[PDB]
Amino acid sequence: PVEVTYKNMRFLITHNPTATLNKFIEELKKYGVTTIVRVSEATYDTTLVEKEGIHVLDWPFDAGAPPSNQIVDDWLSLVKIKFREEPGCCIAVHCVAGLGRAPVLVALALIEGGMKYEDAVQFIRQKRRGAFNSKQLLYLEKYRPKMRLRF
């Protein structure tokens, strides 16, 4: 469980539980996460998660493949609204391995928050070493930001 914080944003990058749901739920609730963004095939049932009060959003894309335009647009709007309506909260992004798709979204949040892509890569790699493969680093390098988040 690795946590990334920048300005008004706080993220928890997680993976499929190593160990079962109860420990997982308790940990998320303790971190203040109000939303889980699952971008891959997930190994747990949402029904218990939602009963605990954490909405799950399922925006999957292929491992190593870049997220669709819609996914990026939807993610950036969620980041824009959620942290303002619930200041101090945490957003969880979940990946199969917690090394590619989930850090990629967090990198996009950091870039749209003012970081250049190399700053964001290092910012996440400081918390989760070995994140991002070559295909994914190139995507972050080529990404051209909308630059519409306000702080």
From Swiss-Prot:
Bilayer topology term: Lipid-anchor
Residues binding substrate: 101
Activity control note: Inhibited by sodium orthovanadate and pentamidine.
Gene Ontology annotations for the cellular component aspect, listed alphabetically: cytoplasm; cytoplasmic side of plasma membrane; early endosome; endoplasmic reticulum; nucleus; spindle
Record's keyword annotation contains Cytoplasm: yes
Entry PTM: Farnesylated. Farnesylation is required for membrane targeting. Unfarnesylated forms are shifted into the nucleus.
MF term (GO), any: protein tyrosine phosphatase activity
Chief subcellular location: membrane
Impact reported for residue 122 to A: Reduces trimerization
Induction: Strongly down-regulated upon tetrodotoxin treatment.
Tissue: Expressed in bone marrow, lymph nodes, T lymphocytes, spleen, thymus and tonsil. Overexpressed in tumor cell lines.
Cellular compartment(s): Cell membrane; Early endosome; Endoplasmic reticulum; Cytoplasm
Pfam families tied to this protein: Tc-R-P (PF22785)
Role this protein plays: Protein tyrosine phosphatase which stimulates progression from G1 into S phase during mitosis. May play a role in the development and maintenance of differentiating epithelial tissues. Enhances cell proliferation, cell motility and invasive activity, and promotes cancer metastasis.
The family this protein is said to belong to: Belongs to the protein-tyrosine phosphatase family.
The protein's name in its UniProt record: Protein tyrosine phosphatase type IVA 1
